[PDB]
Design a protein around this ligand. Structure first.
Ligand SMILES: Cc1ccc(-n2nc(C(C)(C)C)cc2NC(=O)NCCCCCO)cc1
Lengths: 268, 334
């Protein structure tokens, strides 16, 4: 099994990086002078998609992409979008997570070609200009990212507890595929910053049961867990699919990216 | 493209290692993993010592990343503890702040071997604490992979006097603590491999010399196996059925004959070093030093051995209130 598998309750994830919702929203008010609340969550979705596509092009497992996605969220949970360009931060997160998850150091030419190749072919509607950063910018940004995260590198995700829950049900073949995609979809939200991974897993498993119309009422009732918190998570997941329906990413994002607060350069 | 007010704010608030700590000319360790210093705080809130490690290389290598990732999560009395991580932006060097441990088993065994063997209360307390630390790491699926006396640190004077701290110092390479499966080309490290090394350390603590000492000669190491067979004997098929599955098994068969080691046994070895074969210490050692890795006991099982209920019981302070005779760390200069 993986290092620190059963240690979530004594982990830095739990003790430091499960945040209070109101502190998260207070720190967000800096960026909400420029963007609306709606435009702010649309950016969250966009950059989640960018990290997914970077990960796919580099042929990394979903665990590495998830860890990279959490690093990105953690960063902009505390700082403004103007502090570091998120086009630089996104590939830096994949690069760092790839090391932590022990897949290795992605080469310089390979990381930069991936960034370049992903923005051009899959995101040209949002980005007319070519990827402007070289590897020295990545190495610099990696130091800023490691500092803010307080060197908390190990991250727990809902996929492991989800896999254990569906095995207990004995409904692995039926429910796992759909529940797995719903866990992917939660990374479009703040849920990984607000709730423990096992709670998100149960919520995703619950929605999969409703969608596929399999009664698990008695299974869920047999659990010893705060069921009111599981309902909070479900409402966000159901809200997320209504957001998805009404969001035309490809028409809107060029206008939203230009509304992001711009960095102050040196006086010169 | 990075905001200027953000850059200068962080640069202003950022703690630099040279500003917080005094360490020029206080180097205590050098090796493959970099440099270790004995450091004092400049703003004198305490007079406590600190171990300050500069990681070999620059930036965030696989080595730096792995060390930071693990030790940031690990928390146990018998495992060396990380206090702070310093990222120097000027030179891209990474500095780690640890607890300072004045002693270790390499220097303690060397001191007694220079005679006066190790006190028996001390040996039991050392083995218990080593087993306690490794049980915690193994429970968290963290393997050490290089247990040896140099990596068993022991705290000097202060509030943690005589507590064992497991560490990984690096490197001058010996196979004296390497289980036979690794010598026969085992591809993967295991919990069992660590236990074998603890069995070697325990034998060394009892007798003062390394049980599988070997002259300085790929996975296959003939001379190191020959030494294990001189002490343990050559294993029967019954004793280790899956020895056949080892990649180097056919080479083992080409180079060795069981007949050669017919009058060899761990009993016979330990009798020569005045350790009784019907003592609870020996019966524990035998279970640690079992050739077949699936037939070795676990660290949890070793901790429950009646050895540790026999008089004297192990103590938190390994020195048990007695004056520490061992010298402090000399500084290095190159
Ligand atoms: C690359 C690398 C190198 C070393 C480690 N690593 N692994 C461990 C265990 C928790 C497994 C015992 C301790 C360490 N590192 C260290 O123990 N480093 C030196 C501590 C200095 C204390 C002197 O008073 C991890 C990764």
């Amino acid at each position: 099994d993986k290092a620190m598998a059963g240690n979530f309750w004594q982990s830095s994830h739990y003790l430091q990086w499960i945040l209070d919702k109101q502190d998260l929203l207070k720190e967000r008010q800096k960026d909400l002078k420029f963007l609306s609340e709606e435009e702010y969550w649309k950016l969250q979705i966009f950059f989640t998609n960018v990290i997914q596509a970077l990960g796919e092009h580099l042929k990394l497992r979903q665990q590495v992409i998830a860890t990279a996605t959490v690093y990105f969220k953690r960063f902009y949970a505390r700082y403004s979008l103007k502090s570091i360009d998120p086009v630089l931060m996104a590939p830096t997160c994949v690069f760092l997570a790839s090391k932590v998850e022990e897949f290795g150091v992605v080469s310089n030419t390979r990381l930069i070609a991936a960034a370049t190749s992903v923005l051009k072919t899959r995101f040209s509607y949002a980005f007319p200009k070519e990827f402007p950063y070289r590897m020295n910018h990545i190495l610099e940004c990696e130091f800023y990212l490691l500092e803010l995260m307080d060197c908390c590198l190990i991250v727990y995700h809902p996929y492991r507890p989800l896999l254990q829950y569906v095995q207990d049900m004995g409904q692995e073949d039926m429910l796992l595929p759909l529940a797995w995609r719903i866990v992917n979809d939660t990374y479009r939200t703040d849920l990984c910053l607000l709730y423990p991974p096992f709670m998100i897993a149960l919520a995703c498993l619950h929605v999969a049961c409703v969608v596929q119309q399999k009664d698990a009422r008695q299974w869920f009732a047999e659990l010893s867990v705060d069921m009111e918190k599981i309902l909070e998570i479900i409402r966000v997941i159901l809200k997320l699919y209504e957001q998805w329906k009404n969001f035309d990413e490809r028409k809107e994002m060029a206008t939203i990216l230009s509304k992001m607060p711009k960095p102050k350069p040196p006086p010169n | 493209k990075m905001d200027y007010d953000f850059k200068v704010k962080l640069s202003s608030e950022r703690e630099r290692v040279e500003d917080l700590f005094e360490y020029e000319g206080c180097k205590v360790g050098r090796g493959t993993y970099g440099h270790v210093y004995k450091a004092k705080r400049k703003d004198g809130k305490d007079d406590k010592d600190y171990a300050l490690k500069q990681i070999e290389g620059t930036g965030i290598s696989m080595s730096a990343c792995r060390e930071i990732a693990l030790l940031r999560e690990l928390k146990h009395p018998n495992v060396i503890s990380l206090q702070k991580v310093f990222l120097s932006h000027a030179d891209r060097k990474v500095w780690l702040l640890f607890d300072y441990a004045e002693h270790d088993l390499w220097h303690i065994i060397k001191f007694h071997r220079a005679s006066v063997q190790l006190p028996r209360g001390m040996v039991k307390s050392l083995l218990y604490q080593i087993l306690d630390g490794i049980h915690y790491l193994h429970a968290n699926w963290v393997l050490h992979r290089d247990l040896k006396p140099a990596n068993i640190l022991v705290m000097g004077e202060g509030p943690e006097r005589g507590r064992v701290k497991i560490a990984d110092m690096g490197f001058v390479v010996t196979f004296w603590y390497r289980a036979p499966e690794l010598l026969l080309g085992a591809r993967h490290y295991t919990k069992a491999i660590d236990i074998w090394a603890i069995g070697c350390i325990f034998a060394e603590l009892l007798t003062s010399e390394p049980i599988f000492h070997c002259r300085q000669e790929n996975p296959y190491h003939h001379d190191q196996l020959d030494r294990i067979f001189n002490v343990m004997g050559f294993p029967a098929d019954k004793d280790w059925e899956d020895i056949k599955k080892m990649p180097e098994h056919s080479t083992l068969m080409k180079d060795f004959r069981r007949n050669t080691y017919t009058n060899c046994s761990l009993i016979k070895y330990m009798e020569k070093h005045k350790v009784k074969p019907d003592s609870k210490a020996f019966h524990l050692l035998q279970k640690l030093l079992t050739m077949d890795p699936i037939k070795r006991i676990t660290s949890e099982q070793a901790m429950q051995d009646p050895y540790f209920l026999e008089d004297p019981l192990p103590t938190s302070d390994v020195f048990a209130g007695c004056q520490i005779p061992y010298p402090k760390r000399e500084f290095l200069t190159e």
